Design a protein around this ligand. Structure first.
Ligand code: FES
Ligand SMILES: [K+]
Ligand SMILES: [Mg+2]
Ligand SMILES: [Mg+2]
Ligand SMILES: [Mg+2]
Ligand SMILES: [Mg+2]
Ligand SMILES: [Mg+2]
Ligand SMILES: [Mg+2]
Ligand SMILES: [Mg+2]
Ligand SMILES: [Mg+2]
Ligand SMILES: [Mg+2]
Ligand SMILES: [Mg+2]
Ligand SMILES: [Mg+2]
Ligand SMILES: [Mg+2]
Ligand SMILES: [Mg+2]
Ligand SMILES: [Mg+2]
Ligand SMILES: [Mg+2]
Ligand SMILES: [Mg+2]
Ligand SMILES: [Mg+2]
Ligand SMILES: [Mg+2]
Ligand SMILES: [Mg+2]
Ligand SMILES: [Mg+2]
Ligand SMILES: [Mg+2]
Ligand SMILES: [Mg+2]
Ligand SMILES: [Mg+2]
Ligand SMILES: [Mg+2]
Ligand SMILES: [Mg+2]
Ligand SMILES: [Mg+2]
Ligand SMILES: [Mg+2]
Ligand SMILES: [Mg+2]
Ligand SMILES: [Mg+2]
Ligand SMILES: [Mg+2]
Ligand SMILES: [Mg+2]
Ligand SMILES: [Mg+2]
Ligand SMILES: [Mg+2]
Ligand SMILES: [Mg+2]
Ligand SMILES: [Mg+2]
Lengths: 71, 109, 168, 107
RNA sequence: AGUAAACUGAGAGUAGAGUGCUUAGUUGAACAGGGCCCUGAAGCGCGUACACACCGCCCGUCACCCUCCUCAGAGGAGACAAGUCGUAACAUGGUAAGUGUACUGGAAAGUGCACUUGGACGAACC
RNA sequence: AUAGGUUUGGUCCUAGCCUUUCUAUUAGCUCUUAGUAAGAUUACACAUGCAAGCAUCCCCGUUCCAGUGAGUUCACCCUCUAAAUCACCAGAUCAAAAGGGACAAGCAUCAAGCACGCAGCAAUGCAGCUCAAAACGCUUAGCCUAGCCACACCCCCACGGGAAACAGCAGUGAUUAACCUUUAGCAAUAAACGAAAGUUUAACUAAGCUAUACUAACCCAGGGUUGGUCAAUUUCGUGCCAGCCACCGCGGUACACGAUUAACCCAAGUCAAUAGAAGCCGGCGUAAAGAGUGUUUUAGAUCACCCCCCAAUAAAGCUAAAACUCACCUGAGUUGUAAAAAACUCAGUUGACACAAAAUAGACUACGAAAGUGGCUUUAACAUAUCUGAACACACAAUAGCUAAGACCCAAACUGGGAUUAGAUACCCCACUAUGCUUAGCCCUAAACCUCAACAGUUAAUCAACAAAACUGCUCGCCAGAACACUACGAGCCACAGCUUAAAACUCAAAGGACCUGGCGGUGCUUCAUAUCCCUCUAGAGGAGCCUGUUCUGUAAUCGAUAAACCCCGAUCAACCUCACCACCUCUUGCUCAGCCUAUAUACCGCCAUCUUCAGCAAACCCUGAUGAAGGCUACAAAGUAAGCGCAAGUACCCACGUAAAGACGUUAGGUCAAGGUGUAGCCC
């Protein structure tokens, strides 16, 4: 069998790698912002949990850790 | 370009025709063009608002109302509704808009 | 072609071919059998062939199977009254098991046909209604009666459009 | 697939037929925003008459104007039905002649 | 091989017109043995994305216009569509092709490591 | 489905798309009558008129009928038992609230919900319950139609608030492609009321409007189509333009476009658009698909009873060959290749010496689940007496890569230099680094492919093609046109230019897999070229002048050939003529029952080049391939036979040699419309 499909996939992959290399910095910024929004959404969901539970403040001795931050 | 798109809404067909004649007496197309998108009888309608939005036009309502729904939609879509109860008041407002597009050389007479 | 050995087992005709309709007291049927052992071949073929028929004919009966739990195959029927019926199915072919269960707990053909006649009692020939429930929709369909206007127009005299005209 | 697999997966599911340019409607009312011509894809060669119209749904689409000659100017109201013009890519509508401001084709 | 070469006539056509053309004749040679890079020919094979048939096909960059998507404007895809720089792929595509991964480069792509044959190694000895 | 059209130079397979059928809405064009049936697009806003009275006052009804489909698993079955009817009760019928069960569609890129349970009389205790057999969550939908559910302007409700309610009938504005009367009577049935005669009722009945449909009639037929699928076109006009098409396609001097003639199909309709009706037992080596590997629970199956060693892996240790380095001493050179440059003064012998890699064995085919494992020794060690079983977890996963520390002989991305090149960010040469190695973590990807899943079984009636013969049973995973897409988003991850899962929008009628023929190959082997491809022999051209042809320049001033296969060629020939060219002048039924050297050699005949300095071309048969395109040979012969044409033979010249002549089918749309004729088109003062 010929390798036309493999060639098409190879060209697409090469172009995608080149694009990611070209715009990595912008992708870095966007991904960091996305992770911040993810952390905020998780915090909001946990707050919804313990508020619907009827508590005005999170359970005593609890502080939502930063699960999405690299550090 | 220096073009004014106008929708005309009147209370009666005679009023609409009179406003149309006043519009046709326009002669200063060179300095600014006047285009009549749609004329009709009745209160400002969603169709009129949509035409105004599409052509960046202004709705001129002669002795017609525009419900709060229409006003809210016009604000949302950037359309401008101008309800006038007097023919010469409306003509003055039209001339002012023409000048804003530019005073307009067209004299209604 | 239909997947599986004996694909006929998955045809509504085969399921309806069953003849074991349990009396109203039977609620649960537990079939214990052994996957191996020549003396349990009858029970094996019973589970493989007839259980579909029994379940189809007695939908509300809970039939539950148990594999290689006891040295012998057997059926146990739990009846509504609280009675338990044990049937030793070792050495019996599946057809023998079907005959036995029909005889000891199956409704008799007399009862079945009487119930069918009772069901026939529901649909009355003389009733007029939609085709789903009655033979005829309207008495217009009976020959000799005044036919439906949509097919045979009524005389001008018998229509209100002209009765009013005459009255005027 | 085995019987157990088919039973687990249930009957096959038809995705909801994606609506065409008419949003699953026989016709739409549009306002002729502009008129122009398009070169059909090769090998066909021509200047197909098309017009950009803002449909009633608020969408802006391109409608091919059939017939020998037209007079569709700006702001005119037309009726537009489905049926893609084969030689034009993306022009997936047609103005219905004789309706609203699009008069029939002159003989 | 009476060939090459040299030399000497005649004819066609014109009123006249060629160093041209056709043709008769004289003298009259040397090599003729090795090979397959190229031209080619044949046989038997191999490959083939070409079928307007390699003057083929086809990739990518760049700028040439519309549809859609993501997007704070810009990118991505597709289509349309003639160009610019190369010839990356299809023949051993002229460095076999490709997968994963890493670095590098207008651009296809190049190279490094391992893996695949969806290449071959011409199928007795030589 | 009784199927058809469509991928290609062609065949076969898969596959999407479309056609044919039947409905419904809208639109274009058109339309005679009668009966019946059905009839806002919108849970947006409403002018107006009516839609609930009855009855000796109380009571009863206005909670019904009627309406709409916003919402939406309250409809169905069982248990119990309200309200209502049975003049009172009777239990009977009917049917609420409550409790138990059943109950739509898609999305898993919604996989965790976060108290969703139990016990106890209570106190209180236990920490449980739902969920990959789809919990929770998002979006969509009135439904299961003698009818049922839900809503009644909105705030789910409706005290309260927003506000002033047609989703009752008629009707209206807005909106949409969507558009029925601002009719009559309670005469019939139903409902309310009354003891009853009776009264009321936009329920209903009878009418009004509408080809939306059915029926019947009509003594006035329109719509669509006519290249194929698919029934059916004459002449003109246009000339890749105008335009047409459901798919394939048509239009460059038209049975596909416009007009006309005719014909075909249906017919008071026709059919443009849209929607719906037909959606899984088929497959996974190459078309999409067996997921890189192994092991569960819940389960499923019947294949369960019948029935030693070699190269696995981890650890520790060791080293034979060859390197490097250092010592000797000897020499001026070494490396580098197709040839060089660059590079080093290091090179050779002998000896000492690794944390690198493991010739021969191996022509063996074993170990491991896969990745992988081939120097030696030792320790430990290679799960399951039944098979399947992870996007649903656990443990592995070559090479590459990151992190931190060591080793570094050699090799080596990148880098630098030397070449080569039009360029050379490559291929070739040199040097060197990350890296390959050891340790501890990460990373979790491969053409992880034997592209062929596990288990059990059969070789019988085969089998699209190729490949590694065809299948049966069972199970799990996966696939449903191409591309967008090893993508974006979402999610998870020690990953930060990443990996796994993974769509959609726009676009197309194909994409694709396997073959057959042809060409092509800087394609292989073998054999040849006989003035032939190279060397070899002779004579030349390429250097000078001239003759002459052509291209260019010039002119008012031809045309044709113009790679081989043009270029002293058409011409075995131009001062006038020839002459078809240019300038000027002149003639118009004209030498011709006109004329035209005007365009078209890409309409042709005619005569030719070309391979051909070939030998094949072949009708008519037969067979092989499963009766596909296609192919058809072996002489100790195996499916070919072939008429005819060509070669050959025959013939001219001086032989039987040689030279001529001859040279088929075709190739270059090869030359000639200017030998002549000739179709088409064009000019006719
Ligand atoms: S159905 Fe009986 S009269 Fe019409
Ligand atoms: K010379
Ligand atoms: Mg691509
Ligand atoms: Mg190449
Ligand atoms: Mg190459
Ligand atoms: Mg490579
Ligand atoms: Mg490099
Ligand atoms: Mg109609
Ligand atoms: Mg709804
Ligand atoms: Mg997503
Ligand atoms: Mg309302
Ligand atoms: Mg409410
Ligand atoms: Mg109403
Ligand atoms: Mg209205
Ligand atoms: Mg309608
Ligand atoms: Mg013609
Ligand atoms: Mg594939
Ligand atoms: Mg297992
Ligand atoms: Mg797995
Ligand atoms: Mg690894
Ligand atoms: Mg190093
Ligand atoms: Mg491997
Ligand atoms: Mg990848
Ligand atoms: Mg990704
Ligand atoms: Mg992401
Ligand atoms: Mg020669
Ligand atoms: Mg010269
Ligand atoms: Mg010439
Ligand atoms: Mg020429
Ligand atoms: Mg002369
Ligand atoms: Mg002359
Ligand atoms: Mg002439
Ligand atoms: Mg020719
Ligand atoms: Mg001969
Ligand atoms: Mg000859
Ligand atoms: Mg030619
Ligand atoms: Mg020529």
């Amino acid at each position: 069998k010929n390798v036309l499909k493999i060639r098409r996939r190879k060209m697409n992959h090469h172009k995608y790698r080149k694009l990611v290399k070209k715009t990595r910095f912008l992708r870095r910024k966007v991904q960091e912002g996305r992770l911040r929004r993810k952390q905020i959404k998780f915090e909001k969901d946990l707050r919804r949990i313990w508020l619907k539970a009827g508590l005005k403040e999170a359970p005593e001795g609890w502080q939502t850790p930063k699960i999405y931050l690299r550090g | 370009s220096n073009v004014l798109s106008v929708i005309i809404k009147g209370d009666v067909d005679g009023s609409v025709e009179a406003i149309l004649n006043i519009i046709d007496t326009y002669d200063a197309s060179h300095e600014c063009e006047l285009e009549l998108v749609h004329f009709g009888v009745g209160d400002v309608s969603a169709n009129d608002v949509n035409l105004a939005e599409t052509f960046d036009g202004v709705i001129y309502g002669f002795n017609v109302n525009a419900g709060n729904v229409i006003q809210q939609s016009a604000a949302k879509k950037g359309v401008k509704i101008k309800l006038h109860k007097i023919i010469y008041r409306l003509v003055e407002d039209l001339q002012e808009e023409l000048s804003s597009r530019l005073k307009t050389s067209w004299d209604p007479g | 072609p239909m997947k599986g050995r004996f694909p006929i087992r998955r045809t509504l005709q085969y399921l309806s071919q069953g003849n074991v309709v349990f009396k109203d007291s039977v609620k649960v049927m537990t079939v214990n059998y052994n996957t191996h052992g020549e003396l349990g071949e009858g029970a094996r073929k019973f589970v493989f062939f007839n259980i579909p028929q029994i379940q189809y004919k007695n939908p509300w009966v809970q039939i539950m199977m148990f594999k290689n739990m006891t040295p012998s195959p057997f059926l146990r029927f739990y009846l509504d009254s609280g009675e338990q019926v044990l049937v030793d199915v070792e050495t019996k072919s599946n057809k023998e098991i079907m005959e036995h269960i029909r005889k000891i707990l199956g409704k008799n053909e007399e009862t079945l046909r009487e119930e069918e006649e009772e069901k026939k009692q529901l649909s009355h020939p003389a009733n007029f209604g939609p085709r789903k429930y009655c033979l005829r929709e309207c008495i217009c369909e009976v020959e000799g009666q005044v036919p439906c206007p949509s097919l045979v127009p009524l005389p001008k005299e018998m229509r209100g459009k002209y009765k009013a005209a005459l009255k005027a | 697939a085995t019987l157990n697999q088919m039973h687990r997966l249930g009957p096959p599911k038809r995705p909801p037929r994606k609506l065409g340019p008419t949003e699953g409607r026989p016709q739409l009312k549009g306002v002729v925003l502009c008129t122009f011509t398009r070169k059909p894809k090769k090998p066909n060669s021509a200047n197909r008459k098309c017009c950009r119209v803002r449909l009633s749904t608020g969408r802006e689409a391109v409608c091919f104007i059939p017939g020998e000659g037209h007079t569709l100017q700006e702001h005119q109201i037309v009726l537009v039905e489905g049926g893609r013009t084969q030689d034009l890519p993306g022009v997936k509508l047609t103005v219905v002649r004789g309706k609203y401001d699009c008069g029939h084709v002159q003989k």
